Amino acid sequence: AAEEYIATFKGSEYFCYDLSQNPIQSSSDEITLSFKTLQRNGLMLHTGKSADYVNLALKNGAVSLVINLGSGAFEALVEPVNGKFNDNAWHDVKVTRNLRQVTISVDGILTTTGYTQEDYTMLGSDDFFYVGGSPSTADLPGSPVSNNFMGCLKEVVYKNNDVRLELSRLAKQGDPKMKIHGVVAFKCENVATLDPITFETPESFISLPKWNAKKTGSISFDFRTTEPNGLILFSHGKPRHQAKHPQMIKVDFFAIEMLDGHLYLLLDMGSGTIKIKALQKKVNDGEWYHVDFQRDGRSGTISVNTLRTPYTAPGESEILDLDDELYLGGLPENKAGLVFPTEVWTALLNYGYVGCIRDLFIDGQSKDIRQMAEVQSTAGVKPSCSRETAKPCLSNPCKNNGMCRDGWNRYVCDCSGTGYLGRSCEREATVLSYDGSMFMKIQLPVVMHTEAEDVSLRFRSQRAYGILMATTSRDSADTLRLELDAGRVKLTVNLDCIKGPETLFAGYNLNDNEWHTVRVVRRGKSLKLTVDDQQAMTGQMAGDHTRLEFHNIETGIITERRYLSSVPSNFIGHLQSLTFNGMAYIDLCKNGDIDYCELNARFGFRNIIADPVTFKTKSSYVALATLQAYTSMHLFFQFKTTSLDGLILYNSGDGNDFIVVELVKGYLHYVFDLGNGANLIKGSSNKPLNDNQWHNVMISRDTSNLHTVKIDTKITTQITAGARNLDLKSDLYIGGVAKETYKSLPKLVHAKEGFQGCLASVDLNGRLPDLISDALFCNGQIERGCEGPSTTCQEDSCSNQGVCLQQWDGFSCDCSMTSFSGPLCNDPGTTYIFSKGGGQITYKWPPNDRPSTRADRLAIGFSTVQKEAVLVRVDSSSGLGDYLELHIHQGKIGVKFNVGTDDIAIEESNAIINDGKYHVVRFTRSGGNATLQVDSWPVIERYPAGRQLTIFNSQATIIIGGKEQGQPFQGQLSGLYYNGLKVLNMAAENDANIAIVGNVRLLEV
Ligand SMILES: *[C@@H]1O[C@H](CO)[C@@H](O[C@@H]2O[C@H](CO)[C@@H](O[C@@H]3O[C@H](CO)[C@@H](O)[C@H](O)[C@@H]3O)[C@H](O)[C@H]2NC(C)=O)[C@H](O)[C@H]1NC(C)=O
Ligand SMILES: *[C@@H]1O[C@H](CO)[C@@H](O)[C@H](O)[C@H]1O
């Protein structure tokens, strides 16, 4: 009721006066108020729908006036001249309008004047008068800010010649026409400033509370960074099924990210996405930028520093139905139920934001974001903004040549191309060996789909061909491959149809067996490829589709290739620091940080020798299919030999065309004619090479006709005449040729006898031939490996009556029935000591795994002084009766069993075994029949007469020790085998289904 009429606004409160009874009708009016505030942005007052309205606000520290009397708006802007309006002092505004002529005045001095357009002269408002705030702004015309006020307002008046509306007073005192949303004190209270926060690490985020606006709403905030990439705000909907070419999880979402400098609003309301670049200029200069995003249904505006951009979502979709958390500064990892959509490139590239943020408003209301950061207890956030003293890279904090780069308050290091990893490149990175028959496949947990990727890795090979990395999909031909092709690195992106694959090449002579570093960056249609620190190669894919489906990431071999009928060759070499969208897969695999890893490659560097093969005679050779000619040639192989003369390779063509590799007086000769005549390049070594060590040999002829012979570490290069390289004709001979052929080989070839020794790692212009299997013909004997012939079975190969079996790589010993473990059944096998008092081990088959067999077999080792004891006992289920039992009775071993007819017993009467020394017993059953053997006595075998049941139904438990049967065993037992189960071992490995009970201890040796 009192002298002067003041009110305090805090961003959630506003007045709202109903003009509908008494419309404003003004051909001349006057507006007056004093404000007090610290905020760059806030709505003081507004009135009007339609094209008739007055809107007065503080907009980036200045006073912003828009009037429109119906035929065009007037727009004024008063700036402070020596100070700031948001200095938390009072400031007087006065608007005076006389027909079309507007005049505004801050503090009596600061003033401008102007006119509204065409010839309309009256303001007409039958709706609401809003003071201090609004329900929103995207529905309130000519409104530059969306933010509610945060300060004090007094003596707010609107008058004209007729009515006088003292809106400030009416508020305090109350009026049927007046309404106040929220709780407001009617003096001037101080409005707390909203402290800024910094996002120090990418991964630091915050959960903001749910954005409620379905149709219409806003967000405003300020940011500051030199970081070119970072996801700022993101929220999404709830899975609505069916992207009708790949089968993804579709969802409603919106996002604000930074990519490569520029800032983007993304939005998708049901009918597809729209990516809108929110300002043409890069905005990572480290200056505070204000963003105001408001929307009214399917359209809306985004603004950066008073510069607006209209946007429309495609479709007929008016509602953006967000549901759960609203994210700020980055996203949470391994959070169940979160979908990273493909269009938000940052999300899936793991580019969290780093940099300052402040003054967050949602739907007009201000939000204390420092406050949330203390309640959530979020790591990686600090409560300030400090554009720091000195770039951090000065300290040179990045070890082993890692490229430093200055970010917002942190050094950032790129340690690809250094063999290390980790923030500052201190953790040395795992290496992987492949011998052409090895792979390493990362089957991801869930089907990815990406529009952008970073993919980097290091390689090293003597081969000029082979797959480095490739993404594969169980459902299509889609891939992103790097491979070596003719000494070059070849990126290939291919996306299934429904005009073909897009390729990009980089670098040369890279099969030098020094490391190289490949770097791929894709961003939709844009491809970019850099080898080592050469010049980046770019390419722009044609074709409108850009989305890549992939279930797994492969190296070494491309295993997943249903739809391809042909594939790059397997890899021979070493990889390091494979990194895919932030993920260091090799390193994560070795350390066991991920389940979904599958490989038969090996960790750590090793001089590779790929599929060695022995040519036992000189006259031993094999014929392969013709060398594929044609443009350029890259031959590689290695060899071991005691002999100083022999022909290793031969293939001829039309006329005098041929190519040959031979060993002559221990030195390696390359010899050929490609239409100019016969030529000879000698391989460079000092010593003869028949030194029984392994040597590397690489012959090549590029399309510039430059021939290279390498031997171990030393190149020799030479030029040759420019003759169109031509098809070869004959079979390709390796290790020799036919006997009569030596009499008429090209003069200038020396050899009169074939190669004898080993050959390994044969690469024939991209082809890794199995020399034995892929052979078209063989002569003499060619055998696998380079270690002499493999061991074969003899009488005394295995021990303790173990069965010697022949395998491809030598013999083995089946120890099952022998009681002993180890390669030769000479090692002891797992033993349990049964001590005084009695005890018992018990296996219980899970209820639905109970085996019913037709033929059984069981073997055990033991020692005891007892005359009466039960040892092993297999019982069937309750109410079934079928069983099997091994026992000592009157000092002699015995076995008793039953499958559903009468009981059946075999005994060994001869061998006394209650003698304290080690014995072994073997039993077998087929139906009624059985056999029983002890140590090396002759087998006892029984056959009961007449009809006999034959299945041992529903085996339920296995009991060792006899205790239950009231005849406990004292002594030792080892090496129990029953129907494939090495039970005592399973006991010793704490098997889930074994309960040990009583005085039984394991003997650990
Ligand atoms: C338990 O052992 C008895 C006797 O060892 C098994 O019966 C016998 O099985 C053999 C081979 O299956 C029979 O040999 C015969 O040889 C001729 C000539 O090639 C062939 O044409 C016949 O058809 C037959 O296979 C033999 O007749 C048979 N003797 C009998 C039934 O008295 C019995 O199968 C074994 N039980 C189990 C469950 O393994
Ligand atoms: C280089 O600069 C950074 C400060 O961000 C510091 O962490 C290091 O100690 C210095 O090597």
Q: Around Cβ 659, how many Cβ atoms within 10 Å?
A: 21
Cα Rg of the chain, angstroms: 43
Q: How far is the CA of 410 from the centre of ligand 2 (A)?
A: 8
What whole-number distance in Å separates Cα of residue 791 and Cα of residue 902? 49
Q: How far is the CA of 393 from the centre of ligand 2 (A)?
A: 7
**Token pair for 219:** 């967000």
**Are residues 673 and 687 in contact, defined by beta-carbon separation less than 8 angstroms?**
no
What whole-number distance in Å separates Cα of residue 721 and Cα of residue 137? 79
| CATH code for the domain defined by 193-385 | 2.60.120.200
Specify the fold of 609-789.
Jelly Rolls (2.60.120)
Going by the DSSP 8-state scheme, the letter that residue 827 receives in this structure is B
Give the CA distances from residue 824 to residues 804, 813, 836, in Å, rounded to whole numbers and listed in that order: 9, 6, 34
What whole-number distance in Å separates Cα of residue 64 and Cα of residue 51? 18
H or E segment and range at residue 714: strand 714-719
**Are residues 480 and 453 in contact, defined by beta-carbon separation less than 8 angstroms?**
yes
Report the residue among 411, 412, 423, 425 best suited for mutation to probe ligand 2: largest number of ligand atoms under 8 A from its CB: 411
Query: Between β-strands 128-131 and 41-47, what pairing exists: parallel, antiparallel or unpaired?
Result: antiparallel
What whole-number distance in Å separates Cα of residue 479 and Cα of residue 468? 13
Residue 742, φ and ψ in degrees, nearest 5: -60, -35
Q: Is 611 annotated among the ligand-binding residues?
A: no
1-192 and 386-428, same CATH topology: no
Q: Is 52 annotated among the ligand-binding residues?
A: yes
Q: In what order do the strands lie in the sheet with 262-268?
A: 206-208, 326-328, 230-236, 253-259, 262-268, 273-277
Q: Measuring from each residue's beta carbon to the nearest atom of ligand 2, which residues come in under 6 Å?
A: 392, 395, 397, 410-411
**Token pair for 62:** 């200045």
Give the three-class secondary structure for 105.
strand
- Give the closest residue (by CA) to ligand 2 atom 4: 392
What whole-number distance in Å separates Cα of residue 953 and Cα of residue 882? 7
What whole-number distance in Å separates Cα of residue 547 and Cα of residue 452? 8
**Are residues 68 and 74 in contact, defined by beta-carbon separation less than 8 angstroms?**
yes
| Ligand number nearest to the C-alpha of 399 | 2
Beta bridge partners of 806: 811
What whole-number distance in Å separates Cα of residue 166 and Cα of residue 26? 16
| Ligand number nearest to the C-alpha of 856 | 1
| Ligand number nearest to the C-alpha of 942 | 1
Q: Around Cβ 321, how many Cβ atoms within 10 Å?
A: 14
What's 830-1005's CATH class?
mainly beta
Q: How far is the CA of 910 from the centre of ligand 1 (A)?
A: 29
| Ligand number nearest to the C-alpha of 949 | 1
N-term to C-term CA, the chain: 98
| Ligand number nearest to the C-alpha of 394 | 2
Q: Which of 417, 416, 529 is nearest to 480 (CA)?
A: 529
Query: Between β-strands 732-734 and 572-580, what pairing exists: parallel, antiparallel or unpaired?
Result: unpaired
**Token pair for 887:** 């026992």
Q: Is 285 annotated among the ligand-binding residues?
A: no
**Where are the strands (E) in 825-882, listed by range?**
831-844, 855-863, 868-876
What whole-number distance in Å separates Cα of residue 568 and Cα of residue 589? 24
**Are residues 354 and 461 in contact, defined by beta-carbon separation less than 8 angstroms?**
no
What whole-number distance in Å separates Cα of residue 554 and Cα of residue 397? 34
Give the three-class secondary structure for 765.
coil
Q: Which of 641, 632, 635 is nearest to 710 (CA)?
A: 635
Q: Is 495 annotated among the ligand-binding residues?
A: yes
**Ligand 1 atom at minimal distance to the Cα of residue 927:** 38
Residue with tokens 């090209």: 746
Beta bridge partners of 658: 652, 673
169-188 CB burial, b ≥16 within 10 A, e <16 = bbbbeeeebbebeeebeeee
Q: How far is the CA of 390 from the centre of ligand 2 (A)?
A: 10
- Give the closest residue (by CA) to ligand 2 atom 10: 395
Q: Is 122 annotated among the ligand-binding residues?
A: yes
H or E segment and range at residue 359: strand 355-362
- Give the closest residue (by CA) to ligand 2 atom 3: 392
What whole-number distance in Å separates Cα of residue 648 and Cα of residue 668? 10
CA 940 to chain CA centroid, nearest Å: 62
Q: CB-based contacts of 537: which residues, under 8 Å, 6+ apart?
A: 504, 505, 506, 528, 529, 530
**Ligand 2 atom at minimal distance to the Cα of residue 388:** 5
Q: Is 888 annotated among the ligand-binding residues?
A: no
Residue-range domain boundaries for the chain? 1-192, 193-385, 386-428, 429-608, 609-789, 790-829, 830-1005
Q: Is 951 annotated among the ligand-binding residues?
A: yes
Q: CB-based contacts of 50: which residues, under 8 Å, 6+ apart?
A: 70, 124, 141
What whole-number distance in Å separates Cα of residue 890 and Cα of residue 873? 18
Q: CB-based contacts of 587: which residues, under 8 Å, 6+ apart?
A: 421, 427, 429, 430, 577
**Ligand 1 atom at minimal distance to the Cα of residue 950:** 38
| Ligand number nearest to the C-alpha of 928 | 1
Give the CA distances from residue 994 to residues 296, 855, 882, in Å, rounded to whole numbers and listed in that order: 68, 24, 22
**Are residues 91 and 78 in contact, defined by beta-carbon separation less than 8 angstroms?**
no
**Ligand 2 atom at minimal distance to the Cα of residue 392:** 2
Q: In what order do the strands lie in the sheet with 465-472?
A: 502-506, 488-494, 479-485, 465-472, 548-555, 440-450, 597-599
Residue 68, φ and ψ in degrees, nearest 5: -150, 120
CA 406 to chain CA centroid, nearest Å: 27
Residue with tokens 């020399």: 771
Q: How far is the CA of 535 from the centre of ligand 1 (A)?
A: 81
**Are residues 102 and 109 in contact, defined by beta-carbon separation less than 8 angstroms?**
no
Give the CA distances from residue 235 to residues 63, 267, 306, 317, 806, in Å, rounded to whole numbers and listed in that order: 34, 10, 25, 17, 64
**Ligand 1 atom at minimal distance to the Cα of residue 929:** 1
Given in angstroms, what resolution was this structure solved at? 3.0
Beta bridge partners of 430: none
What's the angle, vertex CA 107, arms to CA 104 and CA 110, rounded to 5?
Answer: 55
Outline where 135-257 has alpha helix (H).
167-173
Method: X-ray
What's the angle, vertex CA 837, arms to CA 834 and CA 839, rounded to 5?
Answer: 50
Q: Measuring from each residue's beta carbon to the nearest atom of ligand 1, which residues come in under 6 Å?
A: 926-929, 943, 950
**Ligand 2 atom at minimal distance to the Cα of residue 395:** 1
Which value, to the nearest 10 degrees, does the dihedral of the CA atoms of residues 872, 878, 883, 888 take?
A: 40
**Are residues 922 and 946 in contact, defined by beta-carbon separation less than 8 angstroms?**
no
Query: Between β-strands 868-876 and 101-106, what pairing exists: parallel, antiparallel or unpaired?
Result: unpaired
Q: How far is the CA of 894 from the centre of ligand 1 (A)?
A: 26
What whole-number distance in Å separates Cα of residue 838 and Cα of residue 996? 12
Specify the fold of 790-829.
Laminin (2.10.25)
CA 423 to chain CA centroid, nearest Å: 19
Residue 79, φ and ψ in degrees, nearest 5: -105, 150
What whole-number distance in Å separates Cα of residue 638 and Cα of residue 650? 16
Q: How far is the CA of 817 from the centre of ligand 1 (A)?
A: 25
Report the residue among 926, 947, 949, 951 best suited for mutation to probe ligand 1: largest number of ligand atoms under 8 A from its CB: 926
Q: How many residues does the chain have?
A: 1005
Q: Which amino acid is at 71?
A: S
Q: Which of 197, 45, 67, 62 is nearest to 122 (CA)?
A: 67
Give the CA distances from residue 277 to residues 193, 201, 220, 267, in Å, rounded to whole numbers and listed in that order: 31, 25, 17, 12
Q: Around Cβ 943, how many Cβ atoms within 10 Å?
A: 10
Q: How far is the CA of 180 from the centre of ligand 1 (A)?
A: 103
Query: Between β-strands 971-978 and 6-10, what pairing exists: parallel, antiparallel or unpaired?
Result: unpaired
Q: Is 899 annotated among the ligand-binding residues?
A: yes
Residue numbers preceding breaks in the chain (C to N > 2.5 A): 242, 498
What whole-number distance in Å separates Cα of residue 627 and Cα of residue 635? 10
Q: How far is the CA of 199 from the centre of ligand 2 (A)?
A: 18
- Give the closest residue (by CA) to ligand 2 atom 1: 395
Q: Which of 544, 545, 560, 582 is nearest to 340 (CA)?
A: 582
Residue with tokens 């031939």: 769
**Are residues 958 and 872 in contact, defined by beta-carbon separation less than 8 angstroms?**
yes
**Ligand 2 atom at minimal distance to the Cα of residue 397:** 11
Residue 259, φ and ψ in degrees, nearest 5: -130, 115
Q: How far is the CA of 818 from the centre of ligand 1 (A)?
A: 28
Please state which architecture CATH assigns to domain 386-428.
Answer: Ribbon (2.10)
- Give the closest residue (by CA) to ligand 1 atom 38: 927
Q: Is the peptide bond before 630 cis (omega within 30 degrees of 0)?
A: yes
**Ligand 1 atom at minimal distance to the Cα of residue 928:** 38
**Are residues 646 and 751 in contact, defined by beta-carbon separation less than 8 angstroms?**
yes
H or E segment and range at residue 984: helix 983-988
Q: Is 796 annotated among the ligand-binding residues?
A: no
Residue 699, φ and ψ in degrees, nearest 5: -110, 135
- Give the closest residue (by CA) to ligand 1 atom 5: 943
**Token pair for 278:** 């929110």
What whole-number distance in Å separates Cα of residue 258 and Cα of residue 346? 8
Q: Domain 429-608 classified CATH 1.10.150.120?
A: no
Q: How far is the CA of 989 from the centre of ligand 1 (A)?
A: 42
Beta bridge partners of 887: 870, 894
**Are residues 105 and 36 in contact, defined by beta-carbon separation less than 8 angstroms?**
no
Residue 620, φ and ψ in degrees, nearest 5: -70, 130
Q: How far is the CA of 813 from the centre of ligand 2 (A)?
A: 62
- Give the closest residue (by CA) to ligand 1 atom 1: 929
Q: How far is the CA of 941 from the centre of ligand 1 (A)?
A: 15
Q: Is 157 annotated among the ligand-binding residues?
A: no
Report the residue among 901, 926, 929, 950 best suited for mutation to probe ligand 1: largest number of ligand atoms under 8 A from its CB: 929
| Ligand number nearest to the C-alpha of 929 | 1
Q: How far is the CA of 725 from the centre of ligand 1 (A)?
A: 71
Residue 171, φ and ψ in degrees, nearest 5: -60, -60
**Are residues 304 and 289 in contact, defined by beta-carbon separation less than 8 angstroms?**
yes
**Are residues 384 and 193 in contact, defined by beta-carbon separation less than 8 angstroms?**
no
**Token pair for 749:** 């070839």
What whole-number distance in Å separates Cα of residue 636 and Cα of residue 628? 14
**Ligand 2 atom at minimal distance to the Cα of residue 410:** 5
Q: Domain 1-192 classified CATH 1.10.390.10?
A: no
Q: For the chain, percent helix, then strand, then coil, each to nearest 5? A: 5, 45, 50
531-547 CB burial, b ≥16 within 10 A, e <16 = bbeeeebebebeeeebb
| Ligand number nearest to the C-alpha of 388 | 2
